[PDB]
Structure 1
């Protein structure tokens, strides 16, 4: 079945976890402690020397977005056709771009870079609001009328940014309602309120 190997943080595993939970899938969490990691053996066995590591039967995967696309492909959360599949990728690549900046700020220069980052945030979120405005008035999902892996990834992106910059979605009504709507999905809402998610820090350095 499914196994996710990661440090005890939400980080790059939050979106895929939301996906599995919302889709009613079962998986095992293999928690790797900083000590175990510093031992070196696991890290040396990882393709790119990093986590998360994911297992689907004997298929071993690395790279958070590969896991998301794999689950999206296998579970039918990758658009209804090739055109939608491309739009889903366009959304996810954009989500990834901002996540990288978020990650850089959090771990590289939180104190000195936060003000500049928050000032530039609106412009960074505008694209997703626009995407929403062009798809059924933003009443359904980011692409098409069915959920996709990019939805879970974008939702996480938005959630963590509201912790970083409380109220950042006030400027974006479609994104605001989208967060509330997706968060209300029964299995997702239950997962998001579970200690399995809540008692885990967003990042690994105590910043958010």
Structure 2
């Protein structure tokens, strides 16, 4: 530390890492970048891939939301207890990222014409996570092993935004329903999710959610 998140005034690819920091009792600074400021062209060319989020942890400056999550995982001991768990956590997180990519593409490029096919195809994309939960202490612990990891925060966010997109998408996925309920109920996440910083921030950069 200190921690700084440099991002658009949205939840997007930062709410997972924000929930992570909150739940871990870490404080951080938000450097909010408007599109107006972004369109000025001063910051964009200094970013590695010309994109946000950008994250600072003391002397370490990072880009790529999942690299940031993995760094937080390794540094804060949220990357499982062993080599198997670390690999399985990567496998989970890559799955989360696949579906997030499909979600982002829908929201920003094809919402009106593509939502119906998306929500229709969604249960097939959520089943893997229910399956993962089913094979880990009957879904009563975390996505991998018995301790919270970076992969949990990301999957939790993915499930949260998808409930907004499709209200009852988790009714046919009991383990994922209770999982969302259980992790959201953790005191520090509970507090974060009800905080003005979170509540008064749109999920995405357009209207669409």
TM-score scaled by length of structure 1: 1.00
d(CA) in 1 for partners of 2:182, 2:194: 15
Q: Is 2:136 the counterpart of 1:118? A: no
Structure 1: 5+ residue runs without aligned partners? none
1:53 corresponds in structure 2 to 54
Q: Give 3-state SS (helix, strand or coil) of 2:21's partner.
A: helix
Deviations for 1:91-147, whole angstroms, at most 9, x for unmatched residues? 000000000000000000000000000000000000000000000000010000000
d(CA) in 2 for partners of 1:58, 1:104: 33
2:199 corresponds in structure 1 to 198
Deviations for 1:41-60, whole angstroms, at most 9, x for unmatched residues? 10000000000000011210
d(CA) in 2 for partners of 1:102, 1:187: 27
2:163 corresponds in structure 1 to 162
Q: Give 3-state SS (helix, strand or coil) of 1:144's partner.
A: coil
d(CA) in 1 for partners of 2:25, 2:65: 20
d(CA) in 1 for partners of 2:63, 2:141: 31
Question: RMSD across aligned C-alpha pairs, in angstroms?
Answer: 0.4
The 5 A counterparts of 1:1-208 are 1-208=2-209
d(CA) in 2 for partners of 1:136, 1:36: 48
TM-score scaled by length of structure 2: 0.99
Structure 2: 5+ residue runs without aligned partners? none
Q: 1:69 offset after TM fit, Å?
A: 0.2
Q: Which runs of 4+ in 1 moved over 6 A?
A: none
